[PDB]
Amino acid sequence: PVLENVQPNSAASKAGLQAGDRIVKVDGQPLTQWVTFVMLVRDNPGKSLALEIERQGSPLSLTLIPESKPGNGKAIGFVGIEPKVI
């Protein structure tokens, strides 16, 4: 759960996230599946998510508040994160 990149002017940028950050915990829970993070974002626009990350081996606590996009019939949360390349 290593971010490939963070878009400027995004919720993730506001949270202080950067390319290369590893998401370790979400709301005090270990992040063991990338899809959990994706779902937390999509389903919780406007909610404050407490992140524990590792950045160059060191721990940081950050606050992420997904922004919204219209979706298609139901607005979704959106953070501006490019997932790791596959």
Swiss-Prot record:
Residues 1-86 form the PDZ domain. Signal peptide: none annotated. Disruption phenotype: Essential. Depletion experiments lead to cessation of growth, elongated cells and limited lysis, as well as decreased amounts of sigma-E. Not essential in an rseA deletion strain, when sigma-E is overexpressed or in ompA-ompC deletion strain. In the latter has severely decreased growth at 20 degrees Celsius. Accumulation of an RseA proteolysis intermediate. Induction: Part of the sigma-E regulon. Also has a primary sigma-70 factor promoter. It comes from the Bacteria. Changing residue 23 to Y: Cuts RseA without previous DegS cleavage. Regulated intramembrane proteolysis (RIP) occurs when an extracytoplasmic signal triggers a concerted proteolytic cascade to transmit information and elicit cellular responses. A membrane-spanning regulatory substrate protein is first cut extracytoplasmically (site-1 protease, S1P), then within the membrane itself (site-2 protease, S2P, this enzyme), while cytoplasmic proteases finish degrading the regulatory protein, liberating the effector protein. Belongs to the peptidase M50B family. A site-2 regulated intramembrane protease (S2P) that cleaves the peptide bond between 'Ala-108' and 'Cys-109' in the transmembrane region of RseA. Part of a regulated intramembrane proteolysis (RIP) cascade. Acts on DegS-cleaved RseA to release the cytoplasmic domain of RseA, residue 'Val-148' of RseA may be required for this. This provides the cell with sigma-E (RpoE) activity through the proteolysis of RseA. Interacts with RseA; the third transmembrane domain can be cross-linked to the transmembrane domain of RseA. This is Regulator of sigma-E protease RseP. The lineage of its organism: Bacteria, Pseudomonadati, Pseudomonadota, Gammaproteobacteria, Enterobacterales. The gene is rseP. The chain holds residues 224 to 309 of 450 of the full protein.
